[PDB]
Amino acid sequence: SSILSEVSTRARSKLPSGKNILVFGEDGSGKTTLMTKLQGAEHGKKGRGLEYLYLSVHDEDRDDHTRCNVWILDGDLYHKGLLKFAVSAESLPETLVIFVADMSRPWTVMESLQKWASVLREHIDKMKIPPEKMRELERKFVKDFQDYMEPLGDNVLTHNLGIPVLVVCTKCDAVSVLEKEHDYRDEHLDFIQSHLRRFCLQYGAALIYTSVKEEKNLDLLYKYIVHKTYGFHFTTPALVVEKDAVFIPAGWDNEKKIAILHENFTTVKPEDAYEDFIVKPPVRKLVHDKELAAEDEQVFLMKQQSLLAKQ
Amino acid sequence: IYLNPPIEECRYKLYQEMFAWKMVVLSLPRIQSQRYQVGVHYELTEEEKFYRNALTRMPDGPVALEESYSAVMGIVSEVEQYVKVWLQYQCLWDMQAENIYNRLGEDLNKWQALLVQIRKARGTFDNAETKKEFGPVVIDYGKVQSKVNLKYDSWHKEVLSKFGQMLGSNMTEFHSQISKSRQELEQHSVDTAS
């Protein structure tokens, strides 16, 4: 009625809230470990299906407190419908989504990402967003990408959902172990890095390496998350100098900035299928010993009937 | 107006409770022949040693999860709505009555409308109830029950005073002009040549 006008008009200074950061990833990737550790608690409890984390972001510059909603999603496809509980129309425009590719198993990176490339995409249209709002947010995100200062092209954002997106590859410490235990070549690191950069480019995604065991760039990841979901001041440069852990700001990417990384490796020119140049991790567990079935009385007895007939 | 646990707690704790009611039946160890079948010389994987597939063995499909979370998206959503209502009383501390007076200058008489819905806005408030329950979530308005009470009481008092003040002014208009017109009628010159 009349009150709902008058009292609402008396508004004071606040900070935007209700933001909804979403994490889909392949199961067994330590997604929960990363999100919990960044939250501050070393690790909550895991489980099945959708999980909730209220990420408390405090701004000392304004001295305020806010909570974003980490809706971390289970990896199994049979738990894909419950994603309707994660993203809806009133929540969609202010959602940021990060996929997690556990580098402990590089052989399962791209398709897992590409699984996301289906799932969220499907979920973004099953909800039937009206075309005008999807279009306006898409062009808004395109502009927000283009104005990076520390672009346009055929594949840049060539298919995207118009909300900010990251590809946070966890467990980067493991790259050392799988380097020596597998003789996994450094040029292969360059190849996965370039392919991930092409993936993030066609989604305009900012890519970040991070290692929980090394507590590496966790502060940087927090900074970037707060910068994107809120719009906080950002000062970190494009940390791409060392290959152990890299931070690719959304917009720093260019086709030539991937060409330079293409140049240094000369093993197999990168158009090749990701999976081919990486080596499959062979399955360890042996197949169960075959059934020692007993021949039934009937065909057995018929066989002895035949034997006695031979007599 | 604060939430001592933020509204996200109302959802996180319920999710933990649901997780407990799932683990009570899910984390059961799996019957396995490896007790003597040592031929699989490998540390039993968590997703088989602990029998973590029951969610996919739904007789009714995943609808169960769909309903469960839905209940939560019921329970939390509307209760946040209730929380929202309480936050609306924030205005009792940061508002200018001059703005209201200017906005509703010369209403039905002066306001006569919001002074009616304010009495209804005494709802969610000024009742023997001290804590609103809903399911397993109880939101207790104990610290504010008297504070917002005193503020809203005084504010309603002042609005009533201003309203009734100009109402009395208009009734002075009422009686004065009625009496003067009555005297004019009481001149009673019914027959006159002019």
Side-chain angles (χ1 to χ4, degrees):
Chain A
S1 296
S2 296
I3 309 178
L4 183 63
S5 70
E6 308 293 288
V7 54
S8 51
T9 56
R10 305 301 314 182
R12 297 296 92 194
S13 177
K14 182 64 69 177
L15 187 138
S17 182
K19 313 270 176 292
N20 215 47
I21 178 170
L22 187 153
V23 174
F24 164 74
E26 188 67 27
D27 48 351
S29 311
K31 45 175 76 172
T32 42
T33 311
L34 175 63
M35 281 315 327
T36 49
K37 169 69 213 61
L38 189 45
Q39 172 94 69
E42 61 86 20
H43 167 45
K45 81 162 282 289
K46 290 166 178 280
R48 313 282 295 156
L50 190 143
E51 315 194 359
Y52 191 115
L53 275 300
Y54 65 97
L55 182 65
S56 52
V57 174
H58 161 61
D59 49 340
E60 77 293 338
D61 53 357
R62 308 213 321 158
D63 262 359
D64 199 298
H65 296 284
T66 311
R67 280 82 62 196
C68 186
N69 304 7
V70 165
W71 295 74
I72 190 167
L73 165 72
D74 181 16
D76 186 74
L77 279 300
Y78 164 72
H79 294 287
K80 89 175 71 58
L82 61 89
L83 190 69
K84 66 178 72 66
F85 283 82
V87 173
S88 66
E90 69 275 16
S91 63
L92 174 60
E94 64 183 1
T95 45
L96 176 138
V97 63
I98 62 181
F99 186 81
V100 290
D102 192 353
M103 221 165 278
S104 59
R105 188 57 269 156
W107 179 267
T108 65
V109 169
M110 331 315 298
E111 68 275 17
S112 46
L113 282 73
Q114 295 285 357
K115 187 183 294 180
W116 160 38
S118 66
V119 164
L120 199 57
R121 178 64 245 191
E122 321 315 339
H123 169 92
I124 200 65
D125 58 66
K126 313 310 309 313
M127 81 76 67
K128 176 62 221 73
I129 183 71
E132 70 293 19
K133 293 183 288 294
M134 183 278 288
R135 185 179 296 112
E136 69 184 359
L137 61 84
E138 178 63 275
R139 282 72 201 161
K140 181 174 72 68
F141 179 64
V142 164
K143 179 67 174 66
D144 294 328
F145 164 99
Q146 290 212 341
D147 54 48
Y148 180 49
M149 283 74 74
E150 209 287 323
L152 73 164
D154 73 319
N155 52 0
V156 60
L157 278 78
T158 189
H159 42 267
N160 69 306
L161 73 165
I163 62 170
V165 63
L166 311 180
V167 181
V168 180
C169 45
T170 62
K171 204 64 181 181
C172 302
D173 52 302
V175 68
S176 176
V177 176
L178 61 95
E179 163 63 80
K180 276 74 70 178
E181 82 183 356
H182 292 345
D183 203 57
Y184 164 61
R185 296 324 300 127
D186 292 331
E187 320 297 329
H188 306 186
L189 288 175
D190 284 319
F191 169 75
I192 70 182
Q193 183 200 351
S194 56
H195 208 188
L196 276 185
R197 281 194 65 185
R198 287 195 299 279
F199 179 96
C200 80
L201 189 144
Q202 65 209 68
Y203 289 166
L207 191 152
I208 308 149
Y209 296 78
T210 187
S211 175
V212 175
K213 312 295 298 179
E214 212 75 6
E215 69 274 15
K216 199 189 288 184
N217 291 318
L218 291 188
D219 44 356
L220 167 58
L221 182 62
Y222 200 106
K223 183 184 171 56
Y224 202 80
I225 281 163
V226 180
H227 169 79
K228 275 307 180 55
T229 188
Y230 293 159
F232 273 50
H233 172 65
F234 201 91
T235 187
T236 306
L239 180 64
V240 300
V241 291
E242 85 263 12
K243 65 181 312 185
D244 213 356
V246 178
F247 165 68
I248 301 92
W252 150 258
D253 209 318
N254 300 300
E255 162 47 13
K256 322 303 170 184
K257 306 299 184 292
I258 308 171
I260 183 167
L261 294 174
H262 282 133
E263 163 47 68
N264 64 7
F265 71 85
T266 55
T267 70
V268 175
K269 177 75 191 33
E271 70 275 16
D272 73 78
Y274 171 79
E275 295 294 329
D276 291 357
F277 187 80
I278 301 299
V279 180
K280 185 257 185 162
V283 57
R284 166 193 176 175
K285 289 189 298 182
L286 59 85
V287 59
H288 163 47
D289 185 308
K290 65 178 293 297
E291 164 64 27
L292 192 73
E295 170 153 356
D296 62 351
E297 61 79 11
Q298 191 60 256
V299 74
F300 178 89
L301 176 152
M302 183 278 288
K303 202 177 98 72
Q304 285 68 238
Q305 188 274 331
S306 68
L307 293 151
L308 290 160
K310 298 149 201 150
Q311 179 181 4
Chain B
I1 297 292
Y2 283 167
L3 276 295
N4 194 4
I7 178 64
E8 298 87 329
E9 215 64 49
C10 277
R11 197 176 293 152
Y12 180 28
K13 292 210 190 177
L14 292 183
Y15 275 14
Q16 299 302 112
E17 287 267 12
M18 183 278 288
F19 269 117
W21 203 246
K22 292 195 307 175
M23 299 313 80
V24 63
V25 66
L26 192 47
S27 67
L28 274 297
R30 218 172 197 177
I31 179 65
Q32 61 183 356
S33 174
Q34 195 269 332
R35 296 283 74 77
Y36 182 76
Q37 195 266 328
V38 180
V40 188
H41 182 240
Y42 153 66
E43 168 52 61
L44 275 298
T45 186
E46 200 279 306
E47 298 284 349
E48 186 275 332
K49 194 216 311 178
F50 286 99
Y51 176 96
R52 266 185 46 115
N53 202 7
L55 276 299
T56 72
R57 209 65 54 176
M58 269 305 150
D60 203 6
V63 179
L65 276 296
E66 315 278 352
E67 66 183 1
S68 67
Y69 284 139
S70 84
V72 174
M73 221 74 87
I75 294 286
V76 164
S77 69
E78 68 93 30
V79 76
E80 174 268 353
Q81 186 59 256
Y82 181 94
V83 177
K84 161 69 211 64
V85 160
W86 263 106
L87 275 296
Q88 204 73 0
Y89 291 64
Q90 188 55 249
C91 78
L92 273 297
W93 318 87
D94 49 356
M95 61 79 71
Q96 283 72 6
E98 172 72 12
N99 189 5
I100 292 275
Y101 302 165
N102 300 141
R103 287 183 184 178
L104 277 297
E106 193 62 27
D107 207 4
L108 296 95
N109 195 338
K110 190 44 184 184
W111 300 275
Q112 183 55 257
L114 65 91
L115 194 142
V116 191
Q117 292 91 21
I118 287 302
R119 176 166 266 276
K120 295 183 289 294
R122 263 177 57 198
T124 76
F125 170 74
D126 202 1
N127 51 2
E129 287 208 346
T130 66
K131 51 150 184 54
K132 178 251 177 176
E133 180 269 354
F134 183 78
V137 170
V138 286
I139 170 170
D140 189 359
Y141 45 102
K143 306 317 169 72
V144 299
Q145 176 64 262
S146 163
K147 182 52 70 183
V148 66
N149 193 359
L150 266 296
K151 291 293 297 181
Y152 204 95
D153 188 76
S154 163
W155 183 67
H156 198 68
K157 184 54 65 182
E158 78 167 299
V159 164
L160 199 67
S161 75
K162 300 304 174 181
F163 193 59
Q165 165 54 57
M166 190 177 75
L167 275 295
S169 77
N170 282 6
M171 294 299 103
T172 60
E173 294 273 0
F174 161 49
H175 180 25
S176 59
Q177 70 91 21
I178 287 298
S179 60
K180 294 160 208 156
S181 54
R182 282 197 294 101
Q183 306 300 114
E184 200 273 351
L185 202 44
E186 282 148 15
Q187 76 100 20
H188 292 316
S189 290
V190 287
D191 308 349
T192 185
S194 162

